[PDB]
Every structure is written in structure tokens, then in C-alpha cells.
Amino acid sequence: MQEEAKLTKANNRFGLRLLRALPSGPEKNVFFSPYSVSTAMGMAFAGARGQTQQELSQGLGFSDVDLTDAGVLDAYTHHTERLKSTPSNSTLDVANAAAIQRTLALLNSYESALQSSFGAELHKVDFAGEPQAAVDFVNNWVKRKTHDKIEKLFNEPLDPDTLLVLLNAIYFKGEWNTAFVKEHTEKRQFFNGGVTPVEVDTMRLEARIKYRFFDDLQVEVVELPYRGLDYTMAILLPKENTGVEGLKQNLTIDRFQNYLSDLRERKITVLLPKFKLETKYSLKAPLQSLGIKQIFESGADLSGINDGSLRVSAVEHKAVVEVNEEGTVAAATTGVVIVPYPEPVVFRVDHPFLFFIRNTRTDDIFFVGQVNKL
């Protein structure tokens, strides 16, 4: 398979692995862009060497798909290019950049790689002398690229020893192929945390929708496509009200793709809450739990960046989504901070569930959520 296809496979596997490691609870929703996180970590990977590079190759999923270090940069070039030129009814914008200390010398090779593989602009800032101005700059980049959906990634200035912040932003807007019928939206029961009944605005449609119940993990699956059917929201609904955490833990990328392959269009009724999520994560700890460790530590080898001693102090992520009768808008951003050292069917989404906004042509998974509380 193509390098870009290997990369999609690595990104997707990493995506579910990260999903499993994110903080979750009956009162705490989960939402993030694994594609955003992977892309930002790819930019750091471009500058990693030695054991640090090998550990990242492993962690980001490259090794398991036989995607070589050089192949990663190739694959990213093709992702970046196809993202620009792809004809769709839906909007998907991905942007990358690097905020660099004004007096930091980057290796020419790294600067070139950021441009060629990621289309990443460089922007000089004064991390050391002007922490407020530097973080204002970074946040205003995030705001423009997420189409104003995320105002700030960093709520406080960065530590003045910061030398580089690698940034990714993503924005998605789609309209449903089959809109929910707004006249039929009503307050309906939803089991918050799988156990606490509340009333929430709940949307209704009845149409031929890709659907299957799978006995293996006792899960109903649908895909709700956007216009043109090239993007979809896949929804995984546990049989049991309290089934979501177990579902998340049991899911693998092969099982997920196999579920998708087995869906068939069927006339069903879908009852789906309208909802908005807004989340934020410090990803260092979850990334460490996935075995990505050396990059965070003294002794890290990021010498492909500036031929010096650099490590990652933090990886921060923010994400937002709005789901309603017309469609979906989602955005996310990631910042890597671097320092020196047939019978009727009713698909009733009335309890916690997982969803995935994906491209059906490429298999790219752009957004993933777990809805626990509404």
C-alpha cells in the first residue's frame, strides 16, 4: 500500500490508543482530533534522531505499518497536498506552523521539511523577552486557523525558556446528507453517565442509513454521512446503558474498520441528542502512558531541529464540536512546546456513546468523541 495509506493506518491506530488514555468519566465528556495530534507530533518527529526518533516511530504507529522515517515525511507531503485539492461538499481545513524564538537558528533541513511535508510557516517571536506577546501571537494563530472556534490554546504565557512551539489546527464543517427534521426535535430522556436520567433536546430522522448490530461487543453501529457521502459520523452505541467505557477499551482499529465494512443501508429511525462539546488536554502524561517518553526528558534527541539539546516540555490540545439538525462543525488545535536542556429498528442514542468523524474514501479519522453527560 501507498505511504499515505500506511500513515492513515498508523494515525488511526494511535488515535484509538490515545482515546483509551484520555481522561473520562460519567461527568466528563471526551473530544479530540487524533489527526491534529498526529500531525503536530509528525512535525516534532521530523527533527527527532536516535532512540528518541525510534520511540516516536513506535508510539505514533509508524513502525507497525512499516512506514520508514523517510516514508513519514513523504506520506505527510501527500496528505498535505491532497487536503488542499480534494473536491467535497464538506469543508476540511488543516493548517500547520511553527512559532520560533527570534534568535533560534534552525537547521536548513528542518525548515525545509516543515514546509515540504507540512506546509508549515515559520513565525519568529520573543519567548524569552516578551512571554505575553509570544503567547498572544500563538493564540491568535490558533484562533484564525480554527475559524474563531478556539480562541486560545494556552491560557497563560509559556515559560521563558521556550524556544519552539509546533502548531496544528483543523476545521471541519459538513451538512448531513439526510438532515434531522427540526419540527421533530423535542426534549427526550438521556442517561447521563449511563445512569442519571435527564431530558435533553433530541433530534429525529427516519431514512435508509448504514446500520448493523454486532453481537461480539454488543454494539449498534451507524454512519451518518455528510453531503456527497465522502465524510461521515460513525456512531457506536453500546447495548447496555453503562456500556461505553468497556466498548472503548475493547475496540481495536481492525474491529472498527471491520464494523464499517459490514454496515448495510437499512430504513431506521435515529434519535440523536443535539450537543456541543468543548475540551482541553495536557497530553504529556497520556503520551507517556503510550510509551512516548524520551522526547519529554533531558537526553532527548531533537538535534534534527537545531543540532543542539532540546526536549518537549508539553503537548497541549483543545477541541470543540457542535452537532445539530443541519450538520456538524468541529475544530481542534495541538501545540508541542520545546525547551533546551426487515423489522423496524430504532437507533436510540439515549445513553453514552462513541462517535468518529471520518473520510470514507481515505479512512482518515479527524475527530473522536465519547458523550457521557448532556
From Swiss-Prot:
Record has 4Fe-4S as a keyword: no
Annotated GO MF terms: serine-type endopeptidase inhibitor activity; toxin activity
Residues listed as glycosylation sites in the UniProt record: 89, 250
Entry keywords, A to Z: Glycoprotein, Hemostasis impairing toxin, Immunity, Platelet aggregation inhibiting toxin, Protease inhibitor, Secreted, Serine protease inhibitor, Signal, Toxin
GO cellular component: a single term: extracellular space
Cellular location(s): Secreted
Tissue: Female salivary gland. Ovary. Midgut.
Subunit architecture: Interacts with mouse MCPT4.
Species of origin: Ixodes ricinus
Induction context: Induced by blood feeding.
Family classification: Belongs to the serpin family.
Keyword Secreted appears in the UniProt entry: yes
SUPFAM superfamilies tied to this protein: Serpins (SSF56574)
GO annotation terms (biological process): immune system process
Pfam families documented for this protein: Serpin (PF00079)
Record function comment: Serine protease inhibitor that modulates blood feeding of ticks on vertebrate species. Inhibits host trypsin, thrombin (F2), alpha-chymotrypsin, cathepsin G (CTSG) and mast cell chymase (CMA1). Inhibits host cathepsin G- and thrombin-induced platelet aggregation. Inhibits acute inflammation in the host. Suppresses neutrophil recruitment in inflamed area. Does not inhibit host plasmin (PLG), factor Xa (F10), factor XIa (F11), elastase and proteinase 3/myeloblastin (PRTN3). (Microbial infection) Inhibits IL6 production by mouse splenic dendritic cells in response to Borrelia burgdorferi exposure. Decreases levels of STAT3 phosphorylation in mouse splenic dendritic cells in response to Borrelia burgdorferi exposure and in Borrelia-primed CD4+ T-lymphocytes. Inhibits differentiation of mouse Th17 cells, a subset of CD4+ T-lymphocytes that play a crucial role in protection against extracellular bacteria, in response to Borrelia burgdorferi exposure via inhibition of the IL6/STAT3 signaling pathway.
Name the record gives this protein: Iripin-2
InterPro entries the record matches: Serpin_CS, Serpin_dom, Serpin_fam, Serpin_sf, Serpin_sf_1, Serpin_sf_2
